[PDB]
Structure 1
Amino acid sequence: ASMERFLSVYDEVQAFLLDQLQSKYEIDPNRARYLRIMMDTTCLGGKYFRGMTVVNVAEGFLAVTQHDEATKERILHDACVGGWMIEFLQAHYLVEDDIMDGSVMRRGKPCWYRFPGVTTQCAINDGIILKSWTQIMAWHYFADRPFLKDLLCLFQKVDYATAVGQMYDVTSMCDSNKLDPEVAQPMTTDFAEFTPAIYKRIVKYKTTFYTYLLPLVMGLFVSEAAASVEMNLVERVAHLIGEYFQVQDDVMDCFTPPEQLGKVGTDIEDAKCSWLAVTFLGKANAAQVAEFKANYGDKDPAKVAVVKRLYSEANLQADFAAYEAEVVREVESLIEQLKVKSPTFAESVAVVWEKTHKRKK
């Protein structure tokens, strides 16, 4: 009902983008083609959680708010375009993240850079184009909209936030006091920065702003219902669900086979400050902690297997359920406080929470 409306607007956006390249950017048909496959491979294939949040939030408000048929048509269209803005922004992140994480598979297919006729050299620019598309979309479809200014200001701050998060994420396996562009960076030995506080910082910026804050508040913008809600609660609900979503993603990088995921894990091999590792060091004994340090951050399969072993043995799925329960408490609690000013946005969050809580992919 909304999903089919969503995916129809992509074709409309893609055509307006690719035609503009012909009529303004002197593009030859083969490059226009290349960019079509690029767009397809990088924007489609995923869960569309971020996009469909914008649309579900908008639909929410359209059931209680009196509008003419045309305005209802307009709000539903803006919401899909905004959804695609966020989806193109994630396309951009994944392309760039994959190169940064040396990944092999993504959404069941090879990573964009790993495509034989792409390579790292082109993918980098492809990523930049994906970003650039978000803005052309915005200015084109939203030029004459009351919400343009807010939308763009939020957007570019969500984006900055994400990139700051990546910085924390790719340097999470270095000792802070050793960071220096002049000197090649040695991987941590004491793992003293694998603390819940430092991990929560990584996840906040690299995930929660663009995966939760942005779509929720976006769907409010297209509805012009930003005043109708309590931001401090929206900020808090988004950061809490997002941290969970990332904790989820972390557990799956270890335990969920790529056949279902469908990407191949790299968190152990890459020395990532993952949820699994932090929790482990938060409970392990001296000897367990010792074996970890001699086997983590290495691409050697048996050393990765030694780490996967230690995680099963250290019974981490138990610390997961104590965290999951603690989250549902806090999530349900935060939804209650929202039922006051904005009942329609509370159930919107509830739906996004259910989607998130029961995801496996």
Structure 2
Amino acid sequence: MASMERFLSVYDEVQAFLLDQLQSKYEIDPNRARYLRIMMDTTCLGGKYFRGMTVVNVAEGFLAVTQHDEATKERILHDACVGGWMIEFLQAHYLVEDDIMDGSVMRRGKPCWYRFPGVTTQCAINDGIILKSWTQIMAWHYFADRPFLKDLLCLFQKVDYATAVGQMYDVTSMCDSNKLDPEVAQPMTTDFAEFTPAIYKRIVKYKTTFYTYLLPLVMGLLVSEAAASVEMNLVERVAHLIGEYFQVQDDVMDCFTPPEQLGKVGTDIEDAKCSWLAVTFLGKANAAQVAEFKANYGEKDPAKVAVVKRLYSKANLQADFAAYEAEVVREVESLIEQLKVKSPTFAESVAVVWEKTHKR
């Protein structure tokens, strides 16, 4: 059975389990069970399942080189699928809440969940909470007697927290650190002094790389009982690297991918986000180019957004992006080679992850 089919079948399984448990133990009625079923489908399905499928792909790699009974192989695959869905649901939580936080309009070519007529923000904040609770309900149900449950929960926990810290880094990224104060309304930075590579790196590392790369990779290792096939420091480094590159890609696409292929009208410029484009532009701009960026960035006026987009195109950031990508390729290949010392199999799963990231 192909990996995708198996992963989707487990969705249906987990969904049925969660809805049936709500009826048998949480006194739910059928209409609310329905609403929740539709919330789950709308918020968790539709993407490429890159995260959840990474878990499955890492486990498939170990299965190919490890002696197991058939029933054991099926168990391990089922665990990987469940683990995968945990990470997908974790994502779904973050996306629902982030869309609300940011007043976003669309996500994947459909309206953000909170904008559905019969949802609203008052329900959507809670639906997002439920999404994350379901990760834990799944884990405790499917993984209760598993040797890895402790390590899996502890890692999951740390990643979730990292992700929320990262969200804070991100939503504050256009404030001046020295002025942050719950008592005082926050002005946008005027100097852009904190739009640096180190700062940008910190935002992306927490907000995306831990849940998008490190969690799927390590979860594949845990459900495989293979975390001692690998050097964990290397897993982190490669995760953080490919993860930053995934986010530079999304930053570039926010600005330049037309909205039909992006699945939304990007608003990083209007929102004054600390993007790779902005940091890189500021790292090469002359005094006049800086001054004009400052007059136009972080304002809703489309004329001003167009001045920023012009500045970017004429600063030839395409070239900086090629250089960035070349350096990431060097470093990723290097880390893969290092991974081969203790696990050729895991190194190859990491190669596959890199390839899928490179080609999206």
The bucket for the TM-score relative to the shorter chain is over 0.9
**Alpha-carbon shift at residue 24 of structure 1 (Å):** 0.8
1:95 and 1:353 map into 2 onto residues whose CA distance is 27
Q: What residue is the counterpart of 1:93 in the other structure?
A: 94
**Alpha-carbon shift at residue 239 of structure 1 (Å):** 0.2
**Alpha-carbon shift at residue 215 of structure 1 (Å):** 0.3
Q: What residue is the counterpart of 1:80 in the other structure?
A: 81
Deviations 1:100-130 (A, max 9, x none): 2211111110011111211111110010000
* Secondary structure at 2:296 match in 1: coil
Give percent identity, aligned residues only: 99
**Alpha-carbon shift at residue 23 of structure 1 (Å):** 0.8
1:68 and 1:79 map into 2 onto residues whose CA distance is 17
**Alpha-carbon shift at residue 264 of structure 1 (Å):** 2.2
1:293 and 1:57 map into 2 onto residues whose CA distance is 45
2:97 and 2:321 map into 1 onto residues whose CA distance is 29
Deviations 1:271-320 (A, max 9, x none): 10010000000001111111111111111111111111111111111100
Deviations 1:132-165 (A, max 9, x none): 0000000000000000000000000001001101
Count of aligned residue pairs for this structure pair? 359
Deviations 1:299-352 (A, max 9, x none): 111111111111111111110000000000000010000111000000000000
1:330 and 1:316 map into 2 onto residues whose CA distance is 21
Structure 2 unpaired stretches of 5+: none
Q: What residue is the counterpart of 2:200 in the other structure?
A: 199
1:57 and 1:144 map into 2 onto residues whose CA distance is 22
Greater CA deviation, 263-272 or 86-95?
Answer: 263-272
Q: TM-score, normalised by structure 1?
A: 0.99
Deviations 1:201-249 (A, max 9, x none): 1001001100000000000000000011110100000000000001111
* Secondary structure at 1:190 match in 2: coil
Q: What residue is the counterpart of 1:276 in the other structure?
A: 277
2:74 and 2:266 map into 1 onto residues whose CA distance is 42
* Secondary structure at 1:340 match in 2: helix
Deviations 1:167-206 (A, max 9, x none): 1100000000100101111110000000101100100100
1:114 and 1:318 map into 2 onto residues whose CA distance is 39
Could you tell me whether the CA contact under 8 Å between 1:199 and 1:273 is conserved in 2?
A: yes
1:129 aligns with 2:130: yes
Q: TM-score, normalised by structure 2?
A: 0.99
2:291 and 2:343 map into 1 onto residues whose CA distance is 51
1:65 aligns with 2:66: yes
Deviations 1:26-57 (A, max 9, x none): 11111111111100010001111100000000
2:100 and 2:188 map into 1 onto residues whose CA distance is 19
Could you tell me whether the CA contact under 8 Å between 1:42 and 1:95 is conserved in 2?
A: yes
2:309 and 2:344 map into 1 onto residues whose CA distance is 44
1:255 and 1:173 map into 2 onto residues whose CA distance is 21
1:200 and 1:287 map into 2 onto residues whose CA distance is 26
1:145 and 1:108 map into 2 onto residues whose CA distance is 39
**Alpha-carbon shift at residue 263 of structure 1 (Å):** 2.4
2:239 and 2:95 map into 1 onto residues whose CA distance is 21
Greater CA deviation, 172-181 or 110-119?
Answer: 110-119
